[PDB]
Amino acid sequence: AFQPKVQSRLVGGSSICEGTVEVRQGAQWAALCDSSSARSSLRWEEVCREQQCGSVNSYRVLDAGDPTSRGLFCPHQKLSQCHELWERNSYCKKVFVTCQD
Q: Domain tally for the chain?
């Protein structure tokens, strides 16, 4: 196994356990684009736990319908299943996540 790890962090929160999700894999931090059609709390529970911030309490989407937003895209269900990130250079929908603590 042992493949490199997509890292995640939350920026701009009113605390360190909430904020807009960014990812890096080898590096350059950028907003995570999420292109799921049903909303699932599965990724955000992983992100919150990885921040050591406990469970996810809520999440919301940002930048819906902005053809100019850009960030980095993971084509698998869980970030911990990605070992590689692609640029998405238009229509990046991002996610603001609020963790437990």
A: 1
Counting every residue written for the chain, the total comes to 101
C-alpha closest to that of 44 among 93, 77, 90: 77
Residues 101 and 99: their CA atoms lie apart, in Å, by 6
For the record, the structure tokens of 71 come out as: 């960030």
CB 54, CB 88: distance < 8 Å: no
> Å resolution of this model?
2.2
| Residue from 93, 96, 73 nearest 23 by CA | 73
Closest CA to 43 of 101, 4, 2, 82: 82
CATH number, domain with residue 2: 3.10.250.10
Domain that holds residue 90: 1-101
Q: How was this structure determined?
A: X-ray
Q: What is the largest CA-CA distance in the chain?
A: 38
